[PDB]
């Protein structure tokens, strides 16, 4: 049997599609990039289904954002960051988060160019 | 046992700044970096085409990723020391942060070069070079050193 | 949009090749037997384009390189040739096996030393 459907040449794994874009962009152009391909920035929801994230080098924008007013981290789809998924680490004053293995989120200035990971379910 | 140490220094004295890195194998310097160029400082590193170019990139990025804020403070010396140790097949690690030569570990609330240096140095080093990498480099470098015809 | 595979349902699919990473450390032979037990083999590196994301792989893992004591050359367990300028082979520990690591490097290691490993299915 097959994995997908996914965008062409994307990683496919447990009903999820992934692509690692090595072009450095700030969080917002990264978001725009994933959108333009009918996808979103990486959403971490399961250590098991997304266990491949354990062996990813370097740092990459994911879809986690801090809304200062409620003091909470949430994904692009509005869902709250589920507990015991990511270790959030203060690094730079900012409202966005870089994914780093193993299942870490480094707080970073949304304006800082970084590589990024797009994700598309099903 | 063996140890591979990296000593990152950023010295801001008035209007000029100096970025340097020293790589020591067993308390002996083998590589140095002056902010621009990297070079071997031991015979067995001459002609190396693996570690020098890798470190040149990691070291340059380490400094260029540091978002230093300008200050009215005329002198700031920042040091980041990172060492991995392979002894009895066991991997252990050590890191220190110095501000004007004085060790510190506690982050304060104010936005300063001292705080940013503390909270981002390990991050800026380990982007492409984690602890396991340091140990594997260490073992590979011990190999070169022991096979040195000098 | 297109499909990827065919691959096992619990494996990583990329450009119609299948992969899986095993975090339980074994010596090279045990690792080899493990992949063989899954209608697969240890990681074979054949293309920097088709396997470009190997650049992002963290840590060190047994791959399917085999040292020929005869001519001191390296080949994959399927007997095939290691294409030139694919892997940078680094001497570390005297042995007949190599651990894959980023970026397209191979560290020579004692075959009997337990390590994590990568299995691969091509077609």
From Swiss-Prot, chain A:
Top-rank taxon: Eukaryota
Portion of the full-length sequence here: 94 to 215 of 216
GO term, biological process aspect, one: adaptive immune response
Assembly mode: Homodimer; disulfide-linked. Heterohexamer composed of two subunits of KLRK1 and four subunits of HCST/DAP10. Interacts (via transmembrane domain) with HCST/DAP10 (via transmembrane domain); the interaction is required for KLRK1 NK cell surface and induces NK cell-mediated cytotoxicity. Does not interact with TYROBP. Interacts with CEACAM1; recruits PTPN6 that dephosphorylates VAV1.
Cystine connections: 3-12, 6-17, 34-118, 96-110
Gene Ontology cellular component annotations, sorted alphabetically: cell surface; external side of plasma membrane; membrane; plasma membrane
Domain C-type lectin: 5-120
Key word Membrane present: yes
Protein name: NKG2-D type II integral membrane protein
Keyword terms of this UniProt record: Adaptive immunity, Cell membrane, Differentiation, Disulfide bond, Glycoprotein, Immunity, Innate immunity, Lectin, Membrane, Receptor, Signal-anchor, Transmembrane, Transmembrane helix
Extracellular side: 1-122
Membrane topology value: Single-pass type II membrane protein
Note: Is not capable of signal transduction by itself, but operates through the adapter protein HCST. Some families of ligands for human and mouse KLRK1 receptors have been characterized being very similar in structure and highly likely to be orthologs. In humans, an additional distinct subfamily of ligands (MICA and MICB) differs structurally, having an extra MHC alpha 3-like domain.
Gene name for this UniProt entry: KLRK1
Tissue specificity note: Expressed in natural killer (NK) cells, CD8(+) alpha-beta and gamma-delta T-cells. Expressed on essentially all CD56+CD3- NK cells from freshly isolated PBMC. Expressed in interferon-producing killer dendritic cells (IKDCs).
Function description: Functions as an activating and costimulatory receptor involved in immunosurveillance upon binding to various cellular stress-inducible ligands displayed at the surface of autologous tumor cells and virus-infected cells. Provides both stimulatory and costimulatory innate immune responses on activated killer (NK) cells, leading to cytotoxic activity. Acts as a costimulatory receptor for T-cell receptor (TCR) in CD8(+) T-cell-mediated adaptive immune responses by amplifying T-cell activation. Stimulates perforin-mediated elimination of ligand-expressing tumor cells.
Residue positions the entry lists as glycosylated: 38, 70, 109
Molecular function per GO: carbohydrate binding; identical protein binding; MHC class I protein binding; MHC class Ib receptor activity; signaling receptor activity
Main location: membrane
Taxonomic classification: Eukaryota, Metazoa, Chordata, Craniata, Vertebrata
Localization (cell): Cell membrane
Entry keyword Protein transport: no
């Amino acid at each position: 049997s097959y994995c997908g459907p996914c965008p062409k040449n994307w990683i496919c794994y447990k009903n999820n599609c992934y692509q690692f874009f090595d072009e450095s962009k700030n969080w917002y152009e990264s978001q725009a990039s994933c959108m333009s391909q009918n996808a979103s920035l990486l959403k971490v929801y399961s250590k098991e289904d997304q266990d491949l994230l354990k062996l990813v080098k370097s740092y990459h924008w994911m879809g986690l954002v801090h809304i200062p007013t409620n003091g909470s981290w949430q994904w692009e789809d509005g869902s709250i960051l589920s507990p015991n998924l990511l270790t959030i680490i203060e690094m730079q004053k900012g409202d966005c988060a870089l994914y780093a293995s193993s299942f870490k989120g480094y707080i970073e200035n949304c304006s800082t160019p970084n590589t990024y990971i797009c994700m598309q379910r099903t | 046992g063996h140890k591979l140490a990296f000593n990152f220094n950023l010295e801001i004295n008035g209007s000029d700044t100096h970025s340097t890195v020293d790589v020591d194998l067993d308390d002996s310097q083998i590589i140095t970096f002056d902010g621009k160029d990297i070079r071997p400082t031991i015979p067995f590193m001459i002609g190396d085409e693996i570690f020098l170019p890798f470190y040149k990139n990691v070291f340059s990025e380490f400094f260029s990723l540091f978002r230093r804020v300008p200050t009215s403070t005329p002198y700031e010396d920042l040091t980041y020391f990172y060492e991995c140790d392979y002894t009895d097949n066991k991997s252990t690690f050590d890191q220190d942060y110095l501000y004007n030569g004085e060790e510190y570990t506690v982050k304060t609330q104010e936005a300063t070069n001292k705080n940013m240096w503390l909270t981002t140095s390990e991050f800026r080093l380990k982007k492409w070079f984690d602890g396991e990498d340091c140990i594997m480099h260490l073992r590979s470098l011990v190999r070169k050193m022991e096979d040195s015809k000098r």
